Structures are given as C-alpha cells and as structure tokens.
Design an enzyme around this catalytic site. Sequence first.
Site, PDB file in Angstrom:
ATOM      1  N   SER A  50      -3.382  -2.054  -9.850  1.00  0.00           N
ATOM      2  CA  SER A  50      -2.183  -1.580  -8.995  1.00  0.00           C
ATOM      3  C   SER A  50      -1.359  -1.482  -9.647  1.00  0.00           C
ATOM      4  O   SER A  50      -0.688  -0.391  -9.354  1.00  0.00           O
ATOM      5  CB  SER A  50      -2.106  -2.131  -7.771  1.00  0.00           C
TER       6      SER A  50
ATOM      7  N   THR B  26      -8.655  -7.284  -5.384  1.00  0.00           N
ATOM      8  CA  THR B  26      -8.574  -6.347  -6.640  1.00  0.00           C
ATOM      9  C   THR B  26      -7.002  -5.219  -7.239  1.00  0.00           C
ATOM     10  O   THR B  26      -7.852  -4.803  -8.033  1.00  0.00           O
ATOM     11  CB  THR B  26      -9.888  -4.954  -5.367  1.00  0.00           C
ATOM     12  N   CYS B  27      -6.752  -5.603  -6.338  1.00  0.00           N
ATOM     13  CA  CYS B  27      -5.377  -5.180  -6.950  1.00  0.00           C
ATOM     14  C   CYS B  27      -5.093  -5.793  -8.040  1.00  0.00           C
ATOM     15  O   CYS B  27      -4.419  -5.059  -9.123  1.00  0.00           O
ATOM     16  CB  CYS B  27      -4.401  -5.103  -6.056  1.00  0.00           C
ATOM     17  N   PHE B  28      -5.811  -6.744  -9.036  1.00  0.00           N
ATOM     18  CA  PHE B  28      -5.248  -7.612  -9.552  1.00  0.00           C
ATOM     19  C   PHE B  28      -6.873  -7.915 -10.457  1.00  0.00           C
ATOM     20  O   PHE B  28      -6.686  -8.344 -11.963  1.00  0.00           O
ATOM     21  CB  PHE B  28      -4.195  -8.896  -9.443  1.00  0.00           C
TER      22      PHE B  28
END
Length: 401
Positions: A352, A374-376
């Site tokens: 993101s 999931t953002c990283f």
Amino acid sequence: LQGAMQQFNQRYLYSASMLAAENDPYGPLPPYERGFRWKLAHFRYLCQSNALPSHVKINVSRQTLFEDSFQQIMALKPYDLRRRLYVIFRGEEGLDYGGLAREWFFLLSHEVLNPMYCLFEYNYCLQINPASTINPDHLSYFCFIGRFIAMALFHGKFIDTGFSLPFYKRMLSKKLTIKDLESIDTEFYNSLIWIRDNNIEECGLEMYFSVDMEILGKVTSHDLKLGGSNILVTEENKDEYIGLMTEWRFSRGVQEQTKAFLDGFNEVVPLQWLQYFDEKELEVMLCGMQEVDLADWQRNTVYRHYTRNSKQIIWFWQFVKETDNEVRMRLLQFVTGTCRLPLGGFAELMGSNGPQKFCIEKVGKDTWLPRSHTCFNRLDLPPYKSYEQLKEKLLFAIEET
C-alpha cells in the site's frame, strides 16, 4: 497494454477447466474441504441453465470503446444481458465467435481506469474514488461497471482489473472484521487497536460517536449512532465505538458508488448465486488462474528474523514447491491480498505504501497460527518444530474464512 494482453490470453488457456459445468445435479459417481472446482462447476451450470436464447449486439469502435459500450450496455434491458454476447469492432477484421468479446472484456476492464472519468484511484486495482462525484453521472457509470462485471461471470469471461478482497466480501455480504480494515487503512487500524488496548479515560482523550470526511475540500460529519456527536467514548462504551468505526471505514466516501455497483451487478447475476463462494474464490473467478513461478518468488522474498537457512524458511519453500498451483495462489492472497502478479514479477511487488517484496517474519512461538499483513505483503510465520506442523498450520490458515 500489449504485455497485459499476452498474459491475459495465457490465463485463458491455463484456466480452461474453470468453464466446466456440472452435468446432472446428482453428484459424482463413487469409484471439511472447500470444494472450489465444484462450486465453480455448479455456478456455470446455474448460469447456463438461466441463459436466454439469441443474442444482444454490441457495436464498438476501438478509439471510443468505453463510451460506446456504456451507451449500449445501459440501453439493453438487464436480463437481455443473459443472451449470447455478439460484439463487433466497427470496420475491423471478422465476426465474433467469442474471441472479440474476450477482447472487449479485457479492453473494457482497463478503459474504465482512464483518469478522465475519475472513477478510481491512480494498474489492475480498482478502488472506488470518493471524489468520483466530480463526474456528475458517476452513479450511472458504476451501475454499468456492475452490469459489466456480472456479465463476465455469467458468460465465463475474465477481466484484467479487479476489486480488493474486502470489497468482494461486502459483495458477498460477509461480516467484515477489523483484520480486514488492516488491509485497507493500516493507520486507522492501528488507532482502533490502540483504543481497544489502552485506557482512554486515563489518557485524557475525548472522542465522540461521530466521524468526518473531506472530499474535494467539503467536510461532512456522519453520526455512528443517534446523538453520537454529543456522546463521549468512555472506557465503558469503547467496544461499540470500535465496531461502528470499523464498519464505517470500509465504505467511507463511497457508499453511494458501492450501491450503484451492487445493484447493477444484481440485475444481471443475482448476488445470491454467489453466497457459497468466498472472497478469494470470487476474486479468482473474475481474473483467472495462472501458474505461479516458484523460482522468481523465492529469490525476491525477504526475511525478518529468519534467513535463507532457517529451517522454517526451508520448510516453507518445500511446502510451496509441493502444493498445487491453486494452493499457491491462495497463499498469495493470504499474504499479499491478491492472486494477481505485477507485470515485472515478484521483484516489482508493491505494498500500500510503495515497493514491498514478499516478506516472511518470525514472531511468537510454535503454538500460534500464521498471520498476514497484506498491506506489507508480510507473512507472520511462527517457528514451528517440524515440517508437518508447518504444513498443517499454513494449510489451515490460508484456507480459513
């Protein structure tokens, strides 16, 4: 757009089995598991049983594809979109045997991201733009994108741009969890978890059951319950506040656009026909499967408190080299939030917040389950004591909905 196309058609060849339909409703012949292949097979039988005779014409010029398709899809009655699709590209080559409609769905799923319509942020990621109201007719465009997406599912066609997993979750009306918010706004998520965990009436903080958003300068204040703007978040009611705030963040600034999309979808393919899919299955159903190359993935993976040589890293790549591709994609969604791979493969993986390689980190102890950010694109892998323990925990966790 050419490199995306080659990769597009190649997914059609890898994914042919996805077009299979159940024959009878009476089941296999005799010679919890998720049952994807069979849900897909029964979904195709359902659409095929509900197809209507003859066709609808769709007449588009390449240089004006989106607007022309918008006009013509919107003027057809919704259920006429269950006849055969027959697409002509004006003054060009031959007739539609199915191949030009595959082209059309590919080109449409991209043309919708064109900035001049202002519908989406910024690519293969569709995130609805709050400022889509810049376009005075953006609600009717989202209906069209809803009809267009259902048509692809109905007709066993793929698109090359998709929405995010939490978005498909509301589309299947699954209860959204706070771990889902982590996938959409990590700062908002950290602050929700901070409130839950710490004393607010000793921090001297003061918050109220009301939240505000700023779209093209215009601020608007929404109340999370009746009178909420005057109501103080206290140690006693902060659990409720966290709940209503999670729900509110998932569709912030995009409530109207999301209803115009869902209703457009529902007119073609009733949302109920999808009730048994989960959001990862729904995501794959729209863009197709591809083979996952293990070698590219392994040499562009990065480790926190693990190494190449940690035995759990060795076990992880052994797990991946030995599971089917459908399991590798499902681990891809667990960790990155998408089945899709960027054009440049795993070296170009993105988070993101800018570039971010697939990452595996050691946390906790042997009894914990694997967790994802999931953002990283970070897999939180406990230091399990044996391969079989690792296999069983990782398998339970990528399958869990």
